[model samples]
Target: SEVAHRFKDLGEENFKALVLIAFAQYLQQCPFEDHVKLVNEVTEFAKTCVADESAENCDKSLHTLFGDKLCTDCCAKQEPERNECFLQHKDDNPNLPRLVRPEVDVMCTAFHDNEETFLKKYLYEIARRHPYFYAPELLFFAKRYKAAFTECCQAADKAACLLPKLDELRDEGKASSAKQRLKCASLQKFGERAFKAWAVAHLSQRFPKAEFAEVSKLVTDLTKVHTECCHGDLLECADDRADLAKYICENQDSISSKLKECCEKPLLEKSHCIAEVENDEMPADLPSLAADFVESKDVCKNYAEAKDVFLGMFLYEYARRHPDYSVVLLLRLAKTYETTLEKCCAAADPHECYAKVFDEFKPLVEEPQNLIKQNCELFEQLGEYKFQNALLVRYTKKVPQVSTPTLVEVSRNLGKVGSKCCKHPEAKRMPCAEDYLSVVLNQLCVLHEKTPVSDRVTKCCTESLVNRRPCFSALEVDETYVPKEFNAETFTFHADICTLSEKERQIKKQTALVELVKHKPKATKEQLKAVMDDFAAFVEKCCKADDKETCFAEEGKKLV
Candidate 1:
């Protein structure tokens, strides 16, 4: 523990606590048996970092737990530099996915058994998964999360009580980022000089590889588009973005492959396509500013001086370094952090207060990724017609008030996102779909926001635009709904299954689930999935069986 004392001599008053935070946080990931070994390694690394002044010194001892690549990167930074970057970036494991969302009962039981530990684990997973989110947003998520877990544990149906509430919170977070309309309004309201300062500061964070001049160009173009587009100059806005698209697409070589893929699209689709690209990863040798600035007593003082310069600079350092996350996500986090500073710096223990902020925004990062993955899988299995039909039935149950034509129109919009994305490279596929799908769902939300009908429509339509489709998909049946009865014999296994190609086989299997939604609305989604699974097994068995017709008849009768 005395090793933390060495951090005090390093000059920053709050740096000590930051060091301790890193210590405990890293320890959270270790086994109980490795604690002592880890302690010595951390102690050794800290002492040497304090002793050495050389820029590129390496520490091999910590490699046992921390790994060679990460430890070496931090060691070269020298003392606090080494300390901050190492601590913040230690969890930069690209291999891990977002934490598996626990079933409500499972989470509640975990919460009940050990409240503090459970909460700590929850926040840790969220911080690592959504590394770009600011502390305030996370804190916001945590307080609400604690309440949700606590309240729902006592409910008759824990899932029914908590899941929808969680989805609503996710929607709240999705819409939390600054909207283009408001930015356009800002351009109109605040003069250009003031707006550019803020916009440039924020935009630069998204492209770490871009030089200052390039970021400046990006902001000017962005403001230009907003000014024209929001003022009813669609042709001008569209042209500006096309040029913006060219600027990005031209730089595709040094940037990520996703950008190169975007460049491959038609001229009109380029800007929308380019926006789908994730920000580039900060070069490993490049250093980033840890959020250590929050520790200063003059936190608000610095913020007041020039918020855009300060916060943009603040986010620029953090954002470029985080290669895995989206800029929209980072911007959402930055605003929450600013809001966190508003309350915390004026009160007490600003760092501690900011620590909780990121938790508040912890809701959406997991949901969007999960849904994109799900829809992608569904597209691969169902093809265009069956997938569109699946969506038709799902939305029909959700918002029966909308006309059939309207429902079909929206479903087709969703399928366009899928059909475009299903064949995309695995890595970039979700980002591409999410960018496109977000627009469609957002358009849907805006269209039916006040349609005054089913509770399901109210539930989903009013939700955040970030990933509204997931909320829609979550709806099983709308209020005042009745299933359309069907003739079940049509779903019976046929010898045609053996003759169809692989993709056709999958489509035939998927079509059955869409059929079940109509006739067997009484079944839970999980049960319907089981019925689909059962049919696949039955269909596969009869395909090669000696007495194929009899086996299909005898075994398939259970499907109805």
Candidate 2:
């Protein structure tokens, strides 16, 4: 009665079809012991409906009441008992065509061997063929008969456990003619709708945060692709299931990558990114300076040297955009570019090497003030003086042990002089910046040369300046700097200092593991642990003792 009420709005044919479907669903939920009672109740209800109609063409005979061959062998039996008799003799009845029984037998064997595989094959076959009759049927069957199939598979008499339901299906099939079933357009449409509903519902469970519209569109697109490839013939398309599955999987990966990229942005940017990607309106060449920087790094042979050059170019561009910051920024840019010329340029003359890089790399700078043309000419004359002054400051700090405040003030004084000499508008036209730098260098040598700093510190300071790294700064900051113990291995002269203690390294490793687990919440603890252990082993073996930081930095990126 409830099922009937639910379908009261449907037309007579659909109402009848859905009533049978609902009854089948209800029967599946009934306990195994109560299944017979429910089936009998449904049978009696159908009988009452037939009786109430009292159609003039209605026949009470076994053959006429069911179908021509369904109960033909049971003609001698009473009409009320005919179904049982037909079931007993149906296999032996040569008159019956056995349209579905042979396949049912194969399915029974497949079920005993592997129930999941059997169900997949059975559903695929049914959906491909009688989709009008069986797509909806399989959907109902999967939901309702799940428990029954499990119970039956575990039962001592599996066939007997399932026989009554199988018989009910046979009777339902007998009641409907081919003309009443869906065909062509209607069947294809029903299959698509049923598939979309089923897929979206399950995907919603899997990706709970995913929008319903997004999931629906994904399923719809997959369905459309499958239909087009298979020519709307799901049965013939069954053979292409692997290809279809591959296409769906690829689409899933693409969507996931896009979603990850979108969600990684800040909230406002993420929303915009998602809208653009979801609407398929994303720009083809979105600007990403970080991405470009990484690409540049990948292509360069000398990464550290290239990185300094790129930083100078980047700062120059920033200075141009913000005119007020340009003077200070250009002073820093000049220092950085000067270091790049010393380290990377191969020509004998510093200006020649500077010009070579400017022409080759096209380093970004303000218009009309090309360092290669203006500053490099002056640098050839004054670059050594500026470098010597920096070295003198560094040596004074180490030998006499200047306070951090004093060292900072000295560094600022140098920066101010640099700005006036190199960054002034007219300094490039004349040698004003070079002249000021020479004066500063002479004053620094007079003040600090009294301490008798080691030649080692001076040599390291020169190398540090040439490399454009903070090695000399690191040495100056350290309170204990023994000249006797100073060597390349004793103190890091480059960027990396991978001297993390065992306990500290373990804490970092565990943090990495926690991050991995958090991002992949669906992964089992065991799987995550295995992955983490593998990653840790890789790092331990691959990371060199001398260059652990660089090794870890490079390898760590692979996991992400």
Candidate 3:
């Protein structure tokens, strides 16, 4: 039954009719009758072909149906009649659009049989005639085809991406200009369009609300360009064609912006959703994990390790969202972080240290309480059911525990609830769940000290002194490396650390705060007070001028 269905679907009559209809559709707006006619023709072709028929007879029948000679070669002499027959068909249907349509099975078989000849003729035909529609489709198909081929090629060299096999495609594209690479690029662009169309089509189906109209239009335009690339002269365009190309180039920014606008919400939502799910599974929010930069030895190790991974994931998402940073910069920083993590894990017990680090870093990775609430409200307003529970349980109830929970058991309980809430069917309704969680996490880290906690005095003091002050030296300077020079080292007028001017003192304090907040993350107010007091005392007692006379003393007192 399967074979019969496949044969019927791909039979010669059916294929011819389908091709004819596709051609007719290009010429005529209505294609239903043409499609039906093609189906009937294919069915007839299959019935007449015998199970044990000769190849020669089949070839002859094919020639008669399409009005073309199969071959011109003869035993000893030239075949003038065959040559004339071929020439006649060539002129009669130069476009041969009808021949382009094949049953899927047959097309696949043809491709497998002799990909070079098949794809060359196939791609060239589509590109040459329907440049506008063909170019983008072909380009994206080529890209995806190459990737899929590469993936499958691991099994066999012959199956690898078409890059190595499509020499004709490469040659045809390159022959127009000395810039072989440019021609290759044009072909690649065609592949891009094809791939974009496939991706967009699938994505559109998945997220119907996603606005990919502009992206789709761009893909269509790319198809047109592909035609010009393969079939026409370079940089030479017809009036309307030229205008379309110019419009694409001119509105490139708008196109990119629209794509981001359409995709960002969903992406952010997914990020938060993942976090909420994870948090619900392990609810324990260890105080050290939230406000202390250093990992504790006794508990919350699992949470800490997950947190670091979560942070890395968030950073990657951030980079994707904001591509302003150069790839080199991102790679370098990522490498440094990964290496630091690896080295850190290597020296300490994997079971204890890695987990502890992640636990300590968890607050930075997951969403902050306020942000979670906001997102919950947003999803609720948008009529997202799953997110409504996530908002109430994940963001509002358990997030507060992050700043206070010190025990592993407590943290796990907290994570469990958040995780369970995330799994609710309603949560799936929220589009950008992950982003909401990431934003919440960032907010919590930013305002941890300001938020209420019975342990604030001890936490803030320790953070400011041990974590914040030392970490300042580790902050990135410029775009290249960390600054080794301290404020005291850079200034020459001071006799000792104490004799610096009021202006210098202020700069030092602000720099210390920035470094602490950005890098250390867990600095406490008590620790800050200690550092500030020491600096202040030095300025008041060790400086050449008295505290009353110096501006530094005044600002330092006010800050304290």
Candidate 4:
């Protein structure tokens, strides 16, 4: 009853405005109910504070003050929820909707208790006093409300978008109005109003006509005010305008009744996703969970590397929710500490910094099981410098009948031979191991020839040889030897004469033959068998059919 009395004096516009202000403020402080109460109290204070101002000034200030609060606090806090809510209900209302329901009496009472009169009274009083300043204030209020409306609508739209059927409510008309609202000078305030209008229209469309009676009044009345502002002359309301307002006011009771009926439905409980529950398990099509963990690790690593305050804070937040991901975070922290020490210790005596970092993470390193593989890898790679060099001596001196192009050609030929041999029925079972081995060796030689030598050559060569199953060990010498001839009479070798005479002879010499051999002694017998089996398989898969039985197939003849 007190709320009704207050509602009667205050009017719908002012009352709704007060409720929105309180709701917005409550949302601002925190999502907690206490925060909402605080916001409501703040709105009450704002109403009282601006009560004495001229209607135009009060309206303008009200719009401005609320907008300022919304931006400074509301926008910053629960931004995700606000954005979601805006998108959900963008087209809700362009102005304050009427409240005709008896239940709405609480809202009305709150407004009256908070402010002496309704929103319309305050707005009209401002307009009546500063009629001269009305245009600017109105324009300002319009712009501000539009902005707030757009933000709210966007939030609502986002929510609706998450649901399939509800998406139909996002109308092309609302989109256009939303764009227009966004463009308004008082974007924050006016946008909120416009968004509410659109939301109401959409919701009404979704419900049946029978359900429209109660809610329609609030939605329609607010729409009427918005339409009047946009198309009607506010300074001079004619009989038609008065009639429109009267119609809205009279129908408010019926409209509010319909809204209550509609609200009773279980529409609010519908799912956003196909699976309604929160924290739904990832779908089968989604990437592996390990990939997500790896990605999170990378993110944490980057944050730790940056030593950024915000990134650190963000990582901390994520770590709380995803403890497994925190493993990556810890790794990142360790790496960052290690890197800092490396950089600092390079010039000055950073023993203290190193000690500090070690003190923090010594336990982690000592307990190797706790460290992530990636983190361990990062540390292993630390201080590892690669030094590259070209080993032209062996290549330049060998002049082994084959040129670089020829070697590539040979490698290609061997691969084809191996492939052809394997395709044959007999070779498919037995496979020409020699051809496969030769081809593999040829390719390895080519790769070795191509690879530049480096200070890390020892480490690199060992790995390369092990992986490639190449002939030479990392310790073996790779050099070219010149030919020499000996005469029985002299019993002494002469390099000059033979070198001049046997340029072509050198091409046919046994030295020109390719060779492959194992280097590692500790290598397991199974590893050797695996390599040989693979070589056999490669031959079976690649060599010519006719060469299946031959251990040594002539290079050019094998092509046949």
Candidate 5:
């Protein structure tokens, strides 16, 4: 919610930054039952505080949060001068309790006592600390909190219902939080130069259509936000973030097609949406840079000559090819390589030390090939229905924000590929499916780039098709993916479905089936067919009717 506000329209960075500090501190000191009252009071306080107006209109909550002494102290200062007075003096009470949730037994008792009050208190505490965190991420945690409690509260025994479930959620939080910390640490460790080059390469791979100048601008603007935000400069980060999103939205026609939806998103959400898109599939003709790395006789000599030039090339080339590997992971790997060369090249037996030292690197080189072989083995054994459902379940969980229609399309696309490849009757399905599935995944990467997807999906999509299998396969089903609540009886049919040619009819039929399937999940075979039969009759009758639009609209609503 803090991020949602237009910071540029407000006063300077100090005003925005201090208000957050002031509000969060106020939340800790003050307590209220109605969420609305608390927000209304904070809004009033911010207005008066920024204007350097007297504490006359400000509520008594400020007296508790900061005492009347500082309020009286700050009131004497002028507009520009008063800002720093409160900013420094606001933390009069430095020892506040952290907003950790109560123990499970206490929580259940609190839940039973007054559910709304408990929930609001939890949210208030969460909000005070979560100012820097994006809304969607916090919303996800909050929703999980509510859903878990709602489900567990209905159980016969409260602790028995809640403890294990909440434990798993803590583990889930750790998974995301671990990567978040790693990303920040990675940026802090590797300076802007390394990350800048990586960002350029990442943007280039994902949006190859853009000219170098435009890509550089995006890289330039976005890179600054990462450094500013990743560290603790929340004010500048907000400004830079807004500026970055504004630029992307302004340059709608010039940017890549993959970012079309991203630009259309709300102001604060655009940068994150753009960040979640996958890199483009690497062109087949591009040669592997490692070949040259291994072939060079002056390996140690080249590194000794110009370290930045040598390592820069290595980092850039490797990053360009491996879209799937995390930028942070690969940067660390490059760091390791740099350290390895530094150590190994200084050894008494330099040649011997360097030659056999690529232990982890050697294993990683075969990862793509290895995953391909493993995937096909399972594909052959599982058959179509079971395999596709597994794929369906896999994607739905990993990228919970993606709509079911798109998930169905991706899973069913792979299913169709398996169906054709495995049924060839030439004993070639294993080998044939192995190679062809790579093509499917490659296309999968392409489709995901243009669609709405989660950061997890985007990361998984960046993997080389052969390598993507394991990343996709390892997805833990996220319980947070609540399906869209579609009305069962409502449907809309167009006249084009009847007027189109047979080939066009076939296409529309499949499209219709997809829309219907979204509404009727796991419907029986005869049930689905009966709906289809009804649809066909609707088309048949509607085309002949005098009022075609009304006829289709009314008939379409009759079926479930």
Candidate 6:
């Protein structure tokens, strides 16, 4: 009964293949067991159906007989009745399906309750028949039953359980594709070990005399450092040789001197060796100073004197190494150095200050056309506080003449500008210290004269300069400031042409309507005409009053 149901679920083709193989093997054996004799007798009965028929006709008749007998005898009866009937008539007919019931029941039970046994059976069957097709199906089953598969591995030897025929499959040229190998390795977490082996092989190839365990130690230590510095994120370390080298140079003091010995080969060989050992790249070609400079900004921030001397020495060395190094970067670093000095020494004599602090690297200061000393001399002679009062007076005079509200807005804006660009202790030491305040005050006054006196307009001008120091230098204020068209008593007082003749007023109204329609191209002619009629009614009701500002203010609130 169990065998019939198992074959039914296994489908006709799979069931037929298994049964034929089992019966053929049984007929070849001696003194067969009762179940095996039954299967053999059923095979003989199937051959008797082929009397005088072709092979295809015999196959068709055999398939019908096996399927119909199994379904009719077992499927029609209840479970207890079916079991009793099959046990009672066990020897009456040599029913192949009924004979295999115990084996099928055990296999089916194992498939559900014993994952290792099921997987072993699955792999053995597939590998025995179609070795090459097993990987995709293996991957499918592995993913579907990941927890069960992993648990099976944990209970048994993992390599034996997962890849029971790894060597055999490899010899057959099956499961040997790169993707297949990688998939199998990834499932088994074999990459780290494989990488370790690759690292040792490359290290040996590069340095023939290098000891295996010694190089292995080096690889292990470097991987630890890489994980620590890179936060166990390989993507962060990719192609970043400078940062990787710096971390190694700084942290691995014990391996400090030995690294040179390890990396002593030719450029390409050394780079490849380092890359393999560290699991990262080491570019053979030198990188741009700008890239190094940008990295140094963050690297040197923690150490003030270190930052100054680093930039100073870096500028001197970079300029010496690459005479074509942009003077812009040179001057920029010099400016950065000046601020660093102020932060480091706080009003100390920058020339002597830099000399004393950087005495170890005096060649940087002594180098001719070296911007460091030239900049330091300029710093010492002019001094940060020399024109302090003059700059204040100059900016104070640039503040625009305006109403109290506008003045308050200007005052508040200038305070922010002062705090950001001028009030910081190191601000005076910066190269733009003088021009920073001047340009800000100049642009503020320009903005005040051209912009509407409102908090929004004031904020727009001030916020524009937050990171835009150059905008302050080349200040171009736009005249059409927002709240672009006013409709209030203030507009009448502010409009210089408010006192025009009646005919001129009519012309202005018509011109305003034409300009409005031109700007709003989608406005219909009827809409424009309606707007003009409303304007005429407003003028008739408000414009002839003695107090025109108040009259317009009240009526414009509704009409305009």
Predicted model with the maximum TM-score:
1
lDDT of 1 by residue, 338-374 (tens): 8887887777766677666657657745656677778
Worst 10 residues of 5 by lDDT: 1-10
**Ten residues in a row with the worst lDDT in model 6?**
228-237
Point out where model 6 deviates above 4 Å. Answer: 1-415, 424-468, 476-483, 487-560
Q: Write the per-residue lDDT of candidate 5 for residues 364-446, one digit (tens) a residue.
A: 44454455454455678777655665556455555656555456656765665556664553333433454344445544454
TM-score of each: 0.43, 0.17, 0.19, 0.17, 0.40, 0.16
Between prediction 1 and prediction 5, which has the larger TM-score? 1
Best by lDDT: 1
Model 3, span 143-239: residue lDDT tens: 4344443454344444233434544544333222212222223344335533333323322323223234553564455455444433321222122
Instruction: Predict model 6's lDDT versus the native.
Output: 0.37
lDDT for model 5, on a 0 to 1 scale?
0.55
Model 2: weakest 10-residue lDDT segment is: 177-186
Clashes of each: 20, 2, 68, 85, 3, 0
Off by over 4 Å in 1: 1-206, 211-217, 234-282, 292-299, 313-319, 326-328, 356-363, 422-430, 449-476, 480-560
lDDT values, one for every candidate = 0.56, 0.38, 0.35, 0.32, 0.55, 0.37
Error of 5 at 54 (Å): 17
Model 4, 175-203: lDDT tens digits are 22222232221223234343343323333
Local error of candidate 4 at residue 48 (angstroms): 3.2
Off by over 4 Å in 4: 1-29, 37-41, 46-51, 55-61, 71-560
Q: Quote the lDDT for 349 in model 1.
A: 67
Measured with C-alpha atoms, the lDDT of residue 140 in candidate 5 is 47
